[PDB]
Amino acid sequence: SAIERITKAAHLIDMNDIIREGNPTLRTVAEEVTFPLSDQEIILGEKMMQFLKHSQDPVMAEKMGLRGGVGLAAPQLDISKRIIAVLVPNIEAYDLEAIMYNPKIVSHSVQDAALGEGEGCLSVDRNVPGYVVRHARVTVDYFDKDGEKHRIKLKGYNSIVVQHEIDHINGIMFYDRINEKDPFAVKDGLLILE
Numbered sequence: 001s002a003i004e005r006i007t008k009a010a011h012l013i014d015m016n017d018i019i020r021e022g023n024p025t026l027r028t029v030a031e032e033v034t035f036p037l038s039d040q041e042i043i044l045g046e047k048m049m050q051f052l053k054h055s056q057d058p059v060m061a062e063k064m065g066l067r068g069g070v071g072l073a074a075p076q077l078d079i080s081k082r083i084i085a086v087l088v089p090n091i092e093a094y095d096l097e098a099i100m101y102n103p104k105i106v107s108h109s110v111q112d113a114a115l116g117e118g119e120g121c122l123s124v125d126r127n128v129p130g131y132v133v134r135h136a137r138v139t140v141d142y143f144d145k146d147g148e149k150h151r152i153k154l155k156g157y158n159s160i161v162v163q164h165e166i167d168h169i170n171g172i173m174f175y176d177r178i179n180e181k182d183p184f185a186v187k188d189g190l191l192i193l194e
C-alpha cells in the first residue's frame with residue numbers, strides 16, 4: 001500500500017509519490033483517522049512535513065526534482081486519510097507549521113479572500129489562472145499526533161493554505177473555486193491578498 005511504502009524509515013517522499021488529476025483518489029472524500037493513531041499514521045504526517053521542508057530548500061529541491069509546496073494532503077499520496085501538513089514561511093522561520101489530523105473548519109468569515117497571484121497544486125501539472133475564492137478567516141479544529149485537540153484561528157496566507165489542504169481531503173480542487181466566466185472577477189466582499 002501507499003502508506004506502508006511511504007512510512008518505511010528509508011523512504012523520502014518525492015514527486016513520484018504524488019498522484020495527479022485523473023486519479024479518482026483526489027476526488028474522493030477521505031476517511032477520518034481514529035485515535036489512538038497507528039505508528040504509521042504518525043510517521044506519515046512526519047514524512048509529509050519532511051517533504052514540505054525538502055521542497056522549500058534550494059539544494060534539496062534541486063537534487064530531488066521537487067516542486068515547492070506550502071501544504072500537502074494525504075490524498076495527494078494516494079492515501080485516503082484526513083491528514084494534512086502545512087508549512088507557511090514567514091516573510092520563527094514559519095508563519096504556520098502544523099501536522100493536522102481530522103482538521104475541520106468550525107467557523108468562517110462572511111468576507112472572502114483570494115491570493116492575487118492565484119494558486120497552484122502539486123497534483124496539477126498545468127497553470128490554471130484566476131482568483132481562487134476562499135473564506136478570509138477560518139477557525140479550525142484538529143488533533144495532533146497525541147490526540148490532543150487544537151482550535152486555531154487563521155487569516156491571510158495561512159487561512160488560504162489550510163483551506164486548500166482541507167479541500168483535498170474533501171475531494172475538492174483549487175480550480176473548483178475559480179469563477180469560470182471571469183477568473184479575475186472581484187465580487188463584493190472579496191479581499192485580494194498581496
Ligand SMILES: O=CN(O)CCNC(=O)c1cccc(Cl)c1Cl
Pocket residue numbers: 068069070071072073115118119120121122123160161162164165168
Ligand atoms: O496541496 C498542496 N499542494 O498541492 C502543494 C502545491 N501548492 C501549494 O503549495 C500552494 C500554492 C499556492 C497557494 C496555495 Cl493555497 C498552495 Cl497550498
Ligand code: NI
Pocket residue numbers: 120121122123164168
Ligand atoms: Ni494541492
